[PDB]
């Protein structure tokens, strides 16, 4: 039969490794842009 | 008269012979389904 | 400056290599802008309790994104679906790793989750890709639902 | 039993102040009567919904928790749905933000809405253009959820039916559409008619782009789904006179009628289940602990909300999650920038009380339109025959013009 | 001049909406009027800073493909060697002679 396998499977900290630095770029980009938002306290209160 | 060339054809290419007829009698006109606007191929070329 | 970036992850251990992480992070596009903070707490047990959690500890630092992993223990009867809806209210992205199922791919559901896991309807991609070098062409499909 | 209501600071504000409602004779002859539960949360906040739900529930044991809403932040319903799966308390939203329909949900939970589905939606839509044979349009369909259904459909629809619709470009434009993605792309557009789906801001982002240049014409109309304007009284100024939009029901239904549709059904689904088999049970106790185990010996009273009836209407329920007959209304603004009417819909007639349409100005302070006229005929036998209409696609045959 | 010479000769021409655009149209005294065109062919007419002006408005929401063909008179290119960065290509613009004579 046709077996079949990922490559990295469990290998959490490449991933977490290459996540981060996606996002430190996107958000490197992000902070020269329009006004963000400040975030909220968080659920209580605000829902806008 | 068509089975001449269906044998001509078929002898040519040497394949099996699976006749039938049609149950209704038709040319395929389609119309719709019953009580439904979904078209349903009815006929010869609807069974095909 | 204090660009939180939060990540929902497993056991202490899995959560380490984070604190080091983000100093290579902050070292690399290092300025004076770019200060990030690390918040995380682990998959709490139960469901609603970790929602309340996710309110009453990440977005109460007031966090910018959202990363999340799976369970390690547990199978995939509890994956995390409240971070998707959390944090589908002020519709900040939110990325997955790990978790896959393919019912998140849709983005009606989930809004907007990204993942670098690939959910396994890209095997019929893939055994596309095959079939057509192969010499065969007509296929026989059966599958649950 | 113990059921409690919803609701925050709507177009009522007496609620607890009105009270008494289902309370002194009401449908009287129910067996063990129960009692209601006044709550005027105002702020939606997440958390806030939980702990209210939890502390609801860690009190007097509910079975039902009708919920209204004042915004129109969609994300809410999403919310309830799900806490109708951890906590086995069914709930029916009514008005507000929590009322309008999304796709498919889990069998699990027990949570149920009273909007309409896409699908009913475009068919009145396209019902509509029957009645006036305006039959050439072209879609425009932006990004949100669903977009692939709403096109689906009417393509199927406009195919499968044999009154010979005309459905030009189709331009499913996307993206930020800021300056010349979309300039280009809606500008192939001349067709009489539009079919806009996209949210609140898309919609108003669209018409104040294409107000200028595009289709706004004196036989320019715009129509649109109950998704753009579902709760009223928030019409921006972008919005132009003359547009069209199925909607929900809004001035008749007065939310004192819609919460007396509302626990009706939970007696009479009492009713039903103690019929069926006495039992009156709780669902999951206390929601907060360490109970994560699902016993869940059966949906409870799931099988008994569907196909109930009381008093006059059928409230039926979908496995999906709609109704089988909703009571929806075709309404435009006018001058004064407010919503009237044009028609109602039954179970599957429109029968719209207006004659052939007013024209309204499908503009603001504009240029005057001149290109009506009202040409007056009589019957000769060769040159002009007058016929009756045709049982068969019955608006004409495609050879021939409104002779009314 | 050319509404003359249009309208005098047989060919068979068929022109369209004239648009005189004025003022220095900081960003909007133009957009709300250029939306209008939607035919062929162009002849832009103007001094050389306005006419990169304009190009620029217009090529960057309007009108700019491969079908698009732009015409202008030599009051704009006539000094040559200073194309700036905004012109787009396929251009025909009548000049005098310097490459011969």
């Not at chain 1, 046709?2 to 900290?13: D, H, R, T």
């Not at chain 4, 879609?139 to 259904?149: A, D, K, N, Q």
């Not at chain 4, 096109?151 to 199927?156: D, G, P």
Request: aromatic share 8%; proline share 5%.
């Amino acid at each position: 039969i046709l077996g079949l396998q990922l490559i990295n499977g469990k290998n959490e900290s490449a991933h977490i490794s290459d996540a981060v630095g996606v996002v430190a770029q996107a958000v490197h980009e992000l902070l020269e842009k329009e006004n963000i938002t400040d975030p909220p306290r968080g659920c209580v209160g605000n829902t806008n | 008269f068509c089975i001449d060339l269906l044998i001509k054809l078929a002898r040519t290419m040497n394949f099996t012979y699976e006749v039938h007829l049609v149950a209704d009698g038709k040319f395929g006109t389609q119309e719709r389904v019953n009580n439904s606007n979904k078209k349903e191929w009815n006929g010869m070329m609807g069974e095909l | 400056k204090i660009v939180n970036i939060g990540a929902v992850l497993s056991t202490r251990k899995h959560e380490q290599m984070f604190r080091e992480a983000v100093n290579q992070a902050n070292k690399r596009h290092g300025s004076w802008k770019i200060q990030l903070n690390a918040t995380s707490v682990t998959h709490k047990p139960n469901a609603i309790q970790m929602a309340l959690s996710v309110c009453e500890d990440l977005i109460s630092s007031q966090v910018y994104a959202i990363l999340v992993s799976h369970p390690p223990t547990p199978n995939d009867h509890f994956t995390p679906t409240p971070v998707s809806y959390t944090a589908g209210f002020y519709r900040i992205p939110v990325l997955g790793l790990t978790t896959r199922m393919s019912i998140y791919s849709d983005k009606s559901i989930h809004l907007s989750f990204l993942r670098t896991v690939p959910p396994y309807s890209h095997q019929s991609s893939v055994w596309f890709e095959m079939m057509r070098v192969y010499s065969w062409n007509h296929i026989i499909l059966l599958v649950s639902d | 039993l113990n059921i409690a209501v919803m609701l925050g600071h709507s177009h009522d504000v007496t609620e607890r102040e009105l009270r008494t409602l289902w309370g002194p004779e009401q449908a009287a002859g129910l067996p063990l009567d129960v009692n209601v539960v006044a709550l005027l949360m105002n702020r939606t906040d997440p958390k806030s919904l939980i702990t209210h739900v939890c502390d609801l529930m860690s009190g007097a044991r509910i079975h039902g928790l009708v919920f209204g809403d004042d915004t129109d932040q969609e994300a809410v319903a999403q919310m309830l749905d799900f806490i109708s799966s951890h906590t086995f308390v069914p709930i029916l939203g009514i008005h507000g933000g929590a009322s309008m329909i999304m796709a498919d949900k889990d069998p699990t939970s027990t949570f149920f809405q009273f909007g309409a589905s896409i699908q009913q939606q475009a068919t009145v839509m396209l019902k509509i253009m029957q009645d006036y044979d305006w039959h050439v349009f072209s879609l425009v369909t932006t990004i949100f959820p669903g977009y692939r259904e709403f096109i689906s459909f009417v393509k199927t629809t406009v195919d499968n039916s044999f009154v010979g619709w005309d459905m030009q470009n189709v331009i499913t434009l996307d993206t930020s559409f800021e300056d010349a993605k979309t300039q280009v792309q809606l500008k192939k557009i001349h067709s009489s008619v539009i079919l806009l789906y996209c949210s609140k801001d898309e919609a108003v982002l669209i018409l104040s782009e294409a107000r200028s240049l595009g289709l706004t014409g004196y036989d320019f109309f715009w129509i649109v789904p109950s998704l753009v304007s579902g709760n009223t009284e928030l019409i921006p100024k972008e919005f132009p006179s003359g547009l069209i939009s199925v909607s929900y029901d809004d001035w008749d239904y007065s939310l004192e009628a819609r919460v007396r549709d509302g626990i009706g059904i939970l007696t009479t689904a009492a009713s039903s289940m103690l019929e069926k088999f006495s039992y009156i049970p709780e669902a999951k106790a206390s929601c907060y602990g360490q109970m994560e185990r699902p016993e869940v010996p059966m949906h409870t009273l799931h099988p008994f909300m569907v196909n109930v009836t009381w008093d006059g209407k059928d409230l039926s329920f979908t496995e999906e999650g709609y109704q089988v007959h909703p009571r929806l209304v075709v309404i435009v603004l006018n001058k004064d920038r407010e919503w009237e009417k044009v028609g109602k819909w039954e179970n599957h007639t429109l029968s719209l009380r207006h004659a052939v349409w007013p024209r309204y100005k499908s503009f603001s302070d504009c240029e005057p339109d001149d290109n009506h006229l009202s040409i007056v005929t009589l019957e000769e036998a060769p040159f002009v025959i007058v016929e009756d209409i045709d049982p068969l696609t019955e608006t004409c045959v495609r050879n021939t013009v409104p002779c009314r």
